[PDB]
Write an enzyme that holds these catalytic residues in place. Structure first.
Site, PDB file in Angstrom:
ATOM      1  CB  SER A 160      -1.043  -0.258   0.792  1.00 53.84           C
ATOM      2  OG  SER A 160      -1.546  -1.352   1.394  1.00 53.84           O
ATOM      3  N   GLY A 218       1.352  -0.840   6.117  1.00 55.19           N
ATOM      4  CA  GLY A 218       1.740  -0.888   7.456  1.00 55.19           C
ATOM      5  C   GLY A 218       3.387  -0.312   6.971  1.00 55.19           C
ATOM      6  N   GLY A 271       4.613  -0.136   3.934  1.00 50.73           N
ATOM      7  CA  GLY A 271       4.514  -0.109   2.812  1.00 50.73           C
ATOM      8  C   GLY A 271       5.292   0.259   2.000  1.00 50.73           C
ATOM      9  CD  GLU A 324      -2.053   7.804   3.420  1.00 49.75           C
ATOM     10  OE1 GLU A 324      -0.704   7.655   3.955  1.00 49.75           O
ATOM     11  OE2 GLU A 324      -1.995   6.779   3.247  1.00 49.75           O
ATOM     12  CG  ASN A 344      -8.172   0.735  -0.215  1.00 47.55           C
ATOM     13  OD1 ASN A 344      -8.648  -0.174  -1.178  1.00 47.55           O
ATOM     14  ND2 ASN A 344      -7.652   0.920   1.020  1.00 47.55           N
ATOM     15  CE1 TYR A 375      -9.900   0.164   5.292  1.00 47.37           C
ATOM     16  CE2 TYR A 375      -8.180  -0.433   7.289  1.00 47.37           C
ATOM     17  CZ  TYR A 375      -8.451   0.719   5.914  1.00 47.37           C
ATOM     18  OH  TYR A 375      -8.067   1.403   6.101  1.00 47.37           O
ATOM     19  CD  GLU A 397      -0.643 -13.266 -24.092  1.00 42.83           C
ATOM     20  OE1 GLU A 397      -1.658 -13.013 -22.937  1.00 42.83           O
ATOM     21  OE2 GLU A 397      -1.135 -13.104 -25.596  1.00 42.83           O
TER      22      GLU A 397
END
Lengths: 55, 147, 450, 55, 51, 55, 55, 439
Positions: free
Chosen positions: H139, H143, H145, H182, H205, H223, H253
């Site tokens: 993510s 965590g 991340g 973030e 999300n 979650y 492929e």
């Protein structure tokens, strides 16, 4: 010109104590932390003496 | 209960052994031994990693048939040695109490060497109570190269 | 095939009397004094009736010299539950006990009886011409421990020549014992017993403790149940020289196909299709799950991952009792897939050994009518984790310096401990670094070790 | 040191310009701050020459 | 001496290139600046770390 | 000058010293990773400085 | 052999510079791609002649 | 047909064990070890039930990597619905985590744990030689991340040569988020792990929030619902490798079919025929509405207008399970009459792919029995705004130099943040220069 400045940074290397086997497991972590803090400052001073003297 | 200046915080025990002559199995005893072993970090020294003993007999000591005791390595004896040695040196500095300790053969070298080896055992004991040379105190827990 | 049996230490004498009375109930040696099947006194003179021959008094007594300076183990082998079926006069007691100290045995406390055990081995070594080696029951530190095995091995390699030195080097569980110093003698083992030997084995105690506390569920976590199961494994290995017939896969090619190298000296054992006394209620007699649970850690003596240990050899052994054609019928069961990671310079196939004559069952224990067995014994590089565990224990103890002054003022040396560390490192690197596939020596340009 | 101890003093004397500005929050508050960082390294080697004159 | 001459010679061997084009190569040019200054400082500290 | 340039890149190629192979296999793997870092950076800058001359 | 290795690099520089980068189509961009890959293989040969000869 | 997946972050381990539980439940890989369809213990390796390895005496384990510095997450996983058959020897975790940031887990405290998981990756890389990329679960701030990934992608692209891989980036949602910085970790992750990548796709999300609260009429944003939906979606993605059918093409492929450029790198995963206990009861399934409901704005992971969203590719994935006859009927009933606005100077060939042998639907979840799958892995050049909005918020919050002091003393500098802004501005302005239709 800076051959004494590299001896000064080798004295900053010479400010390193041993990692102290006679050192409490909380305390030589503090030695490592003040180490990495002081070479953060030394890296700032190093890019200072690299960028400033080139002009 | 321990017959010393009690300090589990000032405890680095080396070899413990408790004879369980009470008639019961040792599985729960060893489980509780592991719980006491790992629940505190003062005991973690990691020399001779099987430094325990569980000896079980069936002969009772007294009319209380199932009971036990405590024997175990003592590390809080440093304050006992200091509490005796520095009050020896309290009454040594002024040549105190030579009323009849002026013996048939008396020297200053014997007392000086006595206190010097007392110092060299308490200092080595406090050097072994410190300098964690097996848990993480080496140079190789954080990689290998840290200048 | 009339190999000399040496048993020292408390474990050596304990499993010696136990296993030799298991031979007594196996070969029919009744407490009367002689068998009711064959009327030759003491023992027979067949191909398999060869452990028992004429040395003592014409009675072909069981052949095992029992020496230990701990006197209580000699007393309980003299005053156990059998008083005349062993050597009637050849067991000599020990006068002063080592009392869990190994280093006294090699230098101070066991030196008075080395001449006596040399006399005993000269008595028992000028015997019948069949002598393929030595059935050594090695121990580390229980009684005398590695002391008498060590001095016997060194003077047997420098005085008797180059005879094979088959060892049962027990690496016991620290939970059931009481000593702490045991890594010191277990790492002096490499210096004093490993180089001058010629072949060895391994028996263990941790997996039996693990199954007795969790899997087999027997409330006996002491040396007695360990003896009860190691008696089964000793009977299983001696069944090669004990069950002669069409499929007598004996010691002769066994010692050839065990060990490839000087310091690939340490095999492994995976015998556990065991059925317990609380499982002794006419349960499933399986020839499928004993093949399906081979590389699972249940059969393994030491908990190691087979995913990382490459094998330069593999010796399969399925000793049953049902059909000699069941050899072929079990060849065509599971052996076809077997995609097992190997060294790129070793063979692939599996040897087969069966003993189709049914044995006599040991009573009064934790075992059912066991008839069939699985054992995937081989030399594996997956014991590198076990020896790294032992070396971690010894490094922690040497940082703690426990009983160093106990173990230096008798004849040892700190440089001797350094050379023992180098011998242990050699046994490591013949399994850690050289033991893995060393294909990275052909050629490439990236900046490697040219 | 003891004659090169003033050579780091002429190093700080040599390559210390006036704090010529470049953008807000910069070159008069943080380049000034890295100069005071150099000064605190000077302070540290002053308390470390406190202990080399001890020997 | 020759070491600091080498270090400043490599410093002047990293010129700022001309700004021209539809801003494709400029990010690679910034990356070249920051990286090559990093290993010239690395060579400097290695050389003055042996001495 | 080409003489000083290639002689000095040769001199910093001498600052690519022979290793210290002492240690276990994991320490030798860390040494290998440091070797790959230094070889990657130093030959990339060798070809870059050659291109800044001509190639 | 060191002066040989510096004077040849001098002759890889000297005798053939890149040809006149003006051709009467977009195929001069194609031949400039040829010459940048040509300087890539000059990078190649220049890291051969110092590392597989004197290293 | 063999690949080993790694998972980092708390939500990464959550979607990992949810998806692996769905895998083991839909192949019949029971908690008894063996699959009862045949007589091979642990699992199997035949053509497509190939997520195992012969570890023991035929014993097979669901090979995956579960890594997080916070130690209780693997404990609460290991006491779940798939309890004891996770690996008792590679569940490696730390002691104290980075605790919701980037710099500490990447540079300072993870530097003594990167080599341990690298050694574990080497030990699992000494195993069976099947290799078709990777499957990395992470993510932006869940965590650890970004802290593990920003180092391990560089380590994979330097140490392991030039081998292909694939990663999962969980795009955050500020309405259910747990951080404020973030934009910073998002912009840093996007300049680092995307330029050293081979394939990726971002799952939002907030898109799950939209398709749940605005398209399914359920009232639970937990979650667990996200984990079950991600398990369903990634199971539908992996079902090409997991089950063999008419066009059972490999993931290699797919990744050699999708990506046009190092910068033009990301798809728009179009799968919203949304279902639960509500929208699966007594309905009828057809190949028209599920395919006509793809290009609309309220079906997308990242928001885009259909006319303003230009499809460089329009790849499709079908779970099939009935016939290829109706799929090759819908190639004319739906796919042939598609004169929808496209990209200039590129081929306009629609692709379909059907994979038979049904993956079993989730047991004990919410959705009833469903049949079709419309996992149309298109791509959109107008997702430059989906990161330009974050760059705009990062501009309006970054001129204030907020949260800089937590990201100064751990090795980096302000030039790193300027380079991250430069990289995302370069990606966006490259999309309006040549990605969005030009001359």
């Amino acid at each position: 010109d800076l051959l004494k400045a590299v001896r000064l940074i080798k004295f900053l290397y010479q400010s390193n104590p041993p990692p102290n086997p006679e050192g409490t497991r909380q305390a030589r972590r503090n030695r490592r932390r003040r180490w990495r803090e002081r070479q953060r400052q030394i890296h700032s001073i190093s890019e200072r003496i690299l960028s400033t003297y080139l002009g | 209960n321990m017959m010393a200046a009690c300090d589990p915080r000032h405890g680095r025990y080396l070899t413990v052994a408790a004879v369980f002559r009470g008639r019961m199995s040792m599985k729960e005893v060893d489980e509780q031994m592991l719980n006491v072993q790992n629940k505190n970090s003062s005991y973690f020294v990691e020399w001779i990693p099987n430094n325990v003993k569980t000896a079980v007999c069936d002969i009772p000591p007294r009319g209380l048939k199932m009971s036990a005791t405590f024997i175990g390595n003592s590390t809080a004896i440093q304050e006992l040695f200091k509490r005796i040695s520095e009050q020896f040196t309290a009454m040594f500095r002024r040549k105190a109490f030579l009323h009849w300790y002026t013996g048939e053969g008396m020297d200053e070298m014997e007392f000086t060497e006595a206190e010097s080896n007392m110092n060299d055992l308490v200092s080595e004991y406090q050097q072994y109570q410190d300098a964690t040379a097996d848990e993480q105190g080496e140079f190789e827990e954080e990689g290998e190269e840290d200048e | 095939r009339e190999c000399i049996s040496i048993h020292v230490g408390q474990a050596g004498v304990q499993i010696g009397n136990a296993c030799w009375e298991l031979y007594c109930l196996e070969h029919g040696i009744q407490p009367d004094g002689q068998m009711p099947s064959d009327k030759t006194i003491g023992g027979g003179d067949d191909s398999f009736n060869t452990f028992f021959s004429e040395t003592g008094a014409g009675k072909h007594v069981p052949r095992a010299v029992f020496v230990d300076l701990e006197p209580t183990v000699i007393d309980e082998v003299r005053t156990g539950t059998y008083r005349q079926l062993f050597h009637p006069e050849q067991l000599i007691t020990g006068k002063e006990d080592a009392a869990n100290n190994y280093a006294r045995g090699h230098y101070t406390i066991g030196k008075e009886i080395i001449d006596l055990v040399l006399d005993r081995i000269r008595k028992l070594a000028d015997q019948c011409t069949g002598l393929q080696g030595f059935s050594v029951f090695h121990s580390f530190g229980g009684g005398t421990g590695s002391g008498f095995t060590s001095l016997l091995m060194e003077r047997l390699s420098v005085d008797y020549g180059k005879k094979s030195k088959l060892e049962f080097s027990i690496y016991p569980a620290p939970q059931v014992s009481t000593a702490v110093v045991e890594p010191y003698n277990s790492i002096l083992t490499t210096h004093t017993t490993l180089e001058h030997s010629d072949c060895a084995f391994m028996v263990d105690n941790e997996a039996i403790y693990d199954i007795c506390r969790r899997n087999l569920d027997i409330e006996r976590p002491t040396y007695t149940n360990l003896n009860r199961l190691i008696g089964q494994i000793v009977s299983s290995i001696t069944a090669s020289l004990r069950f002669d017939g069409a499929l007598n896969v004996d010691l002769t090619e066994f010692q050839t196909n065990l060990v490839p190298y000087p310091r690939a000296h340490f095999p492994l054992a995976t015998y556990a299709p065991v059925i317990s006394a609380e499982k002794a209620y006419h349960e499933q007699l399986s020839v499928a799950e004993i093949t399906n649970a081979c590389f699972e850690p249940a059969n393994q003596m030491v908990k190691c991952d087979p995913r990382h240990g490459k094998y330069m050899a593999c010796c399969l052994l399925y000793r049953g009792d049902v059909v000699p054609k069941d050899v072929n019928a079990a060849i065509a069961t599971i052996k076809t897939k077997r995609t097992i990671q190997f060294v790129d310079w070793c063979p692939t196939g599996f040897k087969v050994g069966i003993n189709y004559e049914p044995p006599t069952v040991v009573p009064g224990g934790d075992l059912a009518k066991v008839q069939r067995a699985v054992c995937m014994l081989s030399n594996t590089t997956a014991i590198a984790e076990a020896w790294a565990r032992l070396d971690h224990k010894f490094d922690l103890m040497y940082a703690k310096r426990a009983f160093v002054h106990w173990y230096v003022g008798e004849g040892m040396e700190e440089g001797e401990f350094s050379e023992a560390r180098e011998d242990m490192a050699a046994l490591e690197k013949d399994y850690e670094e050289v033991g893995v596939d060393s294909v990275e020596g052909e050629g490439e340009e990236e900046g490697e070790e040219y």
